[PDB]
Amino acid sequence: FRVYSSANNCTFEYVSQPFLKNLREFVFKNIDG
Amino acid sequence: QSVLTQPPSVSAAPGQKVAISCSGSTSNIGDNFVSWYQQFPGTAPKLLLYDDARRPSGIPDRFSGSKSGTSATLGITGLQTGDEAVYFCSTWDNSLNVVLFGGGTKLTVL
Amino acid sequence: EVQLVESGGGLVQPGRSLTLSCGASGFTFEDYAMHWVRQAPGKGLEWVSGIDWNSGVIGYADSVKGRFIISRDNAKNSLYLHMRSLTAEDTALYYCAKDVYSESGSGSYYDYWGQGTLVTVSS
Numbered sequence A: 001f002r003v004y005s006s007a008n009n010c011t012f013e014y015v016s017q018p019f020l021k022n023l024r025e026f027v028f029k030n031i032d033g
Numbered sequence B: 001q002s003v004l005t006q007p008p009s010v011s012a013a014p015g016q017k018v019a020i021s022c023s024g025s026t027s028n029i030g031d032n033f034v035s036w037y038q039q040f041p042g043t044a045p046k047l048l049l050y051d052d053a054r055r056p057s058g059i060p061d062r063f064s065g066s067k068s069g070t071s072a073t074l075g076i077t078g079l080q081t082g083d084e085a086v087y088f089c090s091t092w093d094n095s096l097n098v099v100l101f102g103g104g105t106k107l108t109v110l
Numbered sequence C: 001e002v003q004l005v006e007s008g009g010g011l012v013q014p015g016r017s018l019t020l021s022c023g024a025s026g027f028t029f030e031d032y033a034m035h036w037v038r039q040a041p042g043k044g045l046e047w048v049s050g051i052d053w054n055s056g057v058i059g060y061a062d063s064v065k066g067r068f069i070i071s072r073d074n075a076k077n078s079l080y081l082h083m084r085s086l087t088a089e090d091t092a093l094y095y096c097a098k099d100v101y102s103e104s105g106s107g108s109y110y111d112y113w114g115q116g117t118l119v120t121v122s123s
């Protein structure tokens, strides 16, 4: 890992189970904050 | 002011078991945990133990050891010619409230 | 991934003050209670100062009480040690050590150590 990010001061953070010849799908919508 | 008391120097042939004794008192070692640090010449000291027995990942298994009472001890085997270094015993103090450190013992491979 | 950068290292005269300003990288700063440990050449380690996650100092060594002031900023990810009124014995190399805990004094183990900087005090 660590190839993407370089440095950061974090505000929100969240962790959970993994999201997932197979077909994933997602809808990302950002409304009202 | 109690002070940790390591041996000034140690020498042993390769293969044998090497004992490094850090001696103190009840306030320092008799009540809390002691950790041990490894320093090569011209290097920043690094972790070699903690919790008096346990080892950080990579910590030489050959170097391990726990002791009770007012003293702590480190045991070493398979002394490679690279294992020549200085070993520090680190300790906290419950009464004076300042971290104490060992004098430092240097290991020689004959 | 944990690099601890130093600064403020250079010959300083017998009476002038100095500011060693360690840094940090690759880990959460305000969670971990940092330290400052010196080593005189040809000698073992000598604890100099500590600090916690709330920047509430732990206490200074007996020889340097009232002349060293340790502080930190968790925003600028730094840890400063403003030496005041140096002397001959204060020459050493100063590692910006680290502690795994945030309370520093239940018998802690200092994991990551910076490469340190050399402060020499001579005329």
Ligand SMILES: *[C@@H]1O[C@H](CO)[C@@H](O)[C@H](O)[C@H]1NC(C)=O
Pocket (backbone or CB within 6 Å): A009, A010, A011, C075, C076
């Ligand atoms: C990160 O740090 C910079 C400098 O203190 C500050 O301007 C910025 O607001 C911070 N970002 C957050 C929200 O963590």
